[PDB]
């Protein structure tokens, strides 16, 4: 009943709301979606059935999408190119701002390498990739500020700004590496791994308040709670790979985990209360207060405005 399902024609890989001003008591209404597994993929912007406002033909596949600010959307293509789009609200038109065509490319060989994940702290854009590379750019710089080459032989899947000038990266062999952007060396400060297992890690998230709490997800569908200072807790959850984990921004006591089996579970800390919000595969989710949106591989967008009712 809560969820209103509008069927689109493109598999939805990413769903992210437009950051809302805290001072004003406004409710988030505009969110953005990115599509994959199609000949001509695209980036759409919707307003809460959701009505699409504007969309742009995105070259390649939209792997990861982050909202830099209210008017800028940073998208990572599957060809490695990291692009920034400027939203002109007055004319409802998305326009290309700045792009780094060869941000990620495999060593020596010809052809391209995919950009798995991006993270943003205006004006710093750190992008990891399948190749061992942690390229760092700036909103107005036409050049790459720093490139940690051969950082990880294995494909890196995700990235997040632990503290400042520090990034936590997960890789295909099950290793959480703490990196530092000030040290000029190309070696990780610390490497956290489960003893004996090499289960790949797909997702990583940091607690909004305390910076020492990091939650990650593996191919075994297990939620591992880590303490970067001191895995504290291993939680059995899904019976299949956990693609994305997200903490609720306003009230962190709530957590949402999406798996390919098709279950948008909700964890409530405030005895963890686990409930199935949805009745193919759920790829992404984004929550901001009482509003949540998730995109599935069944070419559908599920939007709720009364999540906690």
């Amino acid at each position: 009943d809560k969820f209103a399902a509008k069927f689109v024609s493109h598999k939805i890989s990413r769903t992210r709301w437009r950051p809302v001003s805290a001072s004003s008591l406004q409710q988030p209404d505009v969110f953005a979606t990115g599509s994959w597994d199609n000949e001509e993929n695209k980036v759409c912007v919707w307003a809460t059935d959701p009505k699409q406002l504007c969309d742009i033909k995105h070259p390649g596949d939209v792997m990861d999408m982050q909202f830099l600010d209210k008017e800028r959307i940073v998208t990572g293509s599957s060809t490695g190119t990291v692009t920034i789009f400027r939203h002109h609200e007055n004319n409802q038109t998305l326009s290309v701002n700045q792009r780094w065509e060869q941000a990620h490319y495999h060593v020596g060989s010809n052809m391209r390498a995919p950009c798995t994940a991006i993270v943003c702290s205006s004006p710093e854009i750190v992008s990891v990739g399948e190749d061992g590379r942690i390229n760092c750019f700036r909103a107005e710089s036409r050049d790459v500020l720093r490139t940690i080459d051969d950082a990880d032989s294995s494909t890196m899947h995700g990235v997040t700004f632990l503290r400042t000038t520090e990034i936590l990266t997960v890789n295909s062999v099950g290793q959480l590496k703490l990196w530092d952007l000030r040290k000029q060396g190309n070696d990780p400060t610390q490497i956290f791994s489960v003893t004996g297992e090499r289960v790949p890690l797909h997702c990583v998230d940091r607690h909004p308040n305390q910076q020492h709490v990091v939650a990650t997800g593996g191919q075994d569908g297990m939620l591992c709670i880590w303490d970067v200072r001191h895995p504290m807790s291993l939680l059995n959850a899904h019976e299949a790979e956990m693609w994305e984990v997200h903490f609720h921004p306003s009230n962190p006591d709530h957590l949402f985990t999406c798996s390919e089996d098709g279950s948008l579970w909700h964890w409530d800390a405030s005895q963890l209360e686990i409930t199935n919000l949805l009745p193919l595969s759920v790829n992404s989710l984004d929550v901001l207060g009482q509003n949540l949106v998730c995109g599935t591989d069944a070419e559908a967008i599920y939007v709720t405005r009364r999540l906690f009712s």
């Binding site: 001072s23 008591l25 308040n209 009230n251 906690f308």
Partner: protein
């Protein structure tokens, strides 16, 4: 103001404290400044007119006095009001236990600051609402008397009023809160 409010109220809710008592001190400390900011805000006819200053070529609304913004977030259901009511509820519950808690006096002072925040609001509520209707602003405001009866997201009822009353039971211990509740 923005820094204080946002950061310190967040931490009020969810942030590890080695000492249990330190959880309340932070709240009381930021709540005191909220009180003294709201006490002197006398609604003027120029507060409800706003100007736009050109900072770095981006027309951004100017910063109204601390009181304007300290009120407009109170006459709606912003998490300020929700957290204030939740704080009163927690204080009533913990005080009902009648035990020697850590930071009992601190909670007394903080909830007193909360009740005084409420009691001051109602008068300037009439005044602001009256002025507000005349300035042709777009901001919307619902009086406090309809908000106290709102649906509490925790109890799923309008039980703010019941929580308020219970402070009367503790009249022999905390008479100040008793007087404020009666008022």
């Amino acid at each position: 103001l923005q820094f204080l409010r946002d950061t310190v109220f967040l931490r009020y809710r969810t942030r590890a404290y080695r000492r249990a008592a330190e959880k309340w001190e932070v709240a009381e400390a930021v709540l005191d400044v909220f009180y003294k900011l709201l006490k002197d805000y006398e609604p003027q006819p120029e507060d409800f007119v706003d100007q736009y200053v050109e900072l770095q070529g981006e027309e951004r609304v100017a910063f109204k006095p601390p009181g304007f913004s300290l009120m407009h977030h109170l006459l709606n259901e912003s998490p300020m009001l929700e957290l204030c009511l939740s704080l009163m509820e927690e204080g009533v519950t913990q005080l009902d236990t009648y035990a020697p808690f850590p930071g009992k006096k601190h909670l007394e002072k903080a909830v007193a600051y909360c009740f005084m925040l409420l009691n001051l609001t109602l008068q300037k509520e009439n005044r602001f609402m009256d002025l507000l209707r005349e300035s042709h602003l777009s901001m919307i405001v619902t009086p406090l008397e309809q908000l106290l009866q709102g649906i509490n997201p925790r109890s799923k009822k309008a039980d703010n009023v019941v929580n308020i009353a219970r402070y009367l039971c503790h009249g022999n211990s905390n008479a100040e809160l008793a007087f404020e509740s009666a008022k």
